[PDB]
Amino acid sequence: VKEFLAKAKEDFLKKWESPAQNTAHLDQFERIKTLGTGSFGRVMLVKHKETGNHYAMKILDKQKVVKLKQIEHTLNEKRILQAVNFPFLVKLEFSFKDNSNLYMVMEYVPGGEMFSHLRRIGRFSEPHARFYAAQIVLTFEYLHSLDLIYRDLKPENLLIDQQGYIQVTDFGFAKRVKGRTWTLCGTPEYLAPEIILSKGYNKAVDWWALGVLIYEMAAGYPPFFADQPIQIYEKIVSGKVRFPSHFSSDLKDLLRNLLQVDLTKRFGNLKNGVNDIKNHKWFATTDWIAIYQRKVEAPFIPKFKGPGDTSNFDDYEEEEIRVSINEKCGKEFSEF
């Protein structure tokens, strides 16, 4: 099998070492509508004037990026996204920059974020949750083979595409790492114990986070929650879970082995690696190759009423895209 994961790595390393740069420019796109906003930027649905194709364009303001010390994160996201290639990872088509802003143009993923679907319809059934988890399992297998740690899994970062499959976005926090690392990033509810305990950690944190995600999909809320963020940390390093009574025996077994506080016993981090997860009884009815090739009917297909449609995202006040007459922060974004 692993003649796959070897060429995938050669390809990754070639792109990683010499990143694509300046592959389009602003006036090649018509701006239609705001899909999202953030502390340093917004995301807009745009149309390519020539091909008529729809895309999602992330527009980051260089000054705000510097203000909030996000230089390294921003650079890192673009570098990773232009280097990876996998069915469940969003596709970066173009990137470029101007006097004012950085630009990332990604294939438009129209079904919106898993977070809003989960909150719209309440907990998913086990089969529905399992379909999603399987995709994350394969995605982590891939990222891990490249020594990338994702460390940002949460419902809000999974978009649903037209066929009901997952596309992962957000790679700002992802780090290439063989060995340990220390930065404390990620939503509090998803953090593994070893991150909090500050003695270093590795890719095993992704498998913990997968456990949180499966719990949230199946239950409707995360296993470890509280008003005070200090109080969340204690719940995590303790690791006591209350499983709802509707959870099947297989699911509880899998989660006891993913929400394992000791990384050295956690599933996905042992001698058999990811296979301990794939061969778990909860995944017995899953056909791993069929999921990979997208030849499994999705349990849910988003309302998809025509190509430029944005009704799966929220509505935002539109503001102007201003380009200064003068270059800002050229030195810091030269590698972008």
Q: Which is nearer to ligand I5G, 109 or 232 (CB)?
A: 109
Q: Which residues of 253-264 are buried (b: 16+ CB within 10 A; e: fewer)?
A: ebbebbbbbebe
Cβ–Cβ < 8 Å for 84, 12: yes
154 annotated ligand binder = yes
Nearest distance from residue 34's CB to ligand I5G, in Å? Answer: 9
Q: Minimum distance between the CB of residue 307 and ligand I5G, rounded to whole angstroms? A: 13
Residue 97 has phi, psi (to 5 degrees) of -145, 160
157 assigned binding-site residue: yes
Question: Among 171, 183, 187, which Cα is nearest to 75's?
Answer: 171
Distance between CA atoms of 106 and 120, rounded to whole angstroms? 26
203 among annotated binding-site residues:
no
Which one is catalytic: 61, 98, 147, 152?
Answer: 152
CB-nearer residue toward ligand I5G: 169 or 257 = 169
Residue nearest to ligand I5G (CB): 38
Check if 152 is active-site.
Answer: yes
Which residue in this structure is represented by tokens 């970062």?
A: 157
42 is in an annotated binding site: yes
CB of 336 to ligand I5G, least distance (A): 15
Q: Which residues pair with 242 in a beta bridge?
A: none
SS3 121: helix
Q: Is 180 helix (H, G, I), strand (E, B) or coil?
A: coil
DSSP assigned state of 100 = S
- How far apart CA 155 and CA 310 sit, in angstroms, is 19
CB of 321 to ligand I5G, least distance (A): 13
Distance CA 268, CA 320 (A): 47
Measured distance CA(198)–CA(175) in Å, rounded: 17
Q: Write down the least CB distance from residue 114 to ligand I5G, Å.
A: 10
Cα 248-159-250 angle, rounded to 5 deg: 10
Cβ–Cβ < 8 Å for 182, 202: no
Which lies closer to ligand I5G via its Cβ, residue 181 or residue 310? 310
In whole angstroms, the minimum distance from the beta carbon of 40 to ligand I5G comes to 4
Nearer to ligand I5G, 108 or 140 (CB): 108
Task: Closer to ligand I5G by CB, 106 or 213: give it.
Answer: 106
Q: Is 317 annotated as a binding residue?
A: no
DSSP SS3 for 143:
helix
**Binding residue per annotation — 320?**
no
The smaller minimum CB distance to ligand I5G, of residues 66 and 261, is found at: 66
Q: Do residues 76 and 172 lie in contact, with contact meaning Cβ atoms separated by under 8 Å?
A: yes
Binding positions for ligand I5G, rule: CB under 6 A: 35-43, 56, 58, 90, 106, 108-109, 156-157, 159, 169-170
Cα radius of gyration (the chain): 20
The annotation status of 43 as a binding-site residue, yes or no, is yes
User: What is the set of active-site residues?
Assistant: 152
Binding-site residues for ATP sit at 35-43, 58, 107-113, 154-157
Annotated binding residues, written as ranges, equal 35-43, 58, 107-113, 154-157
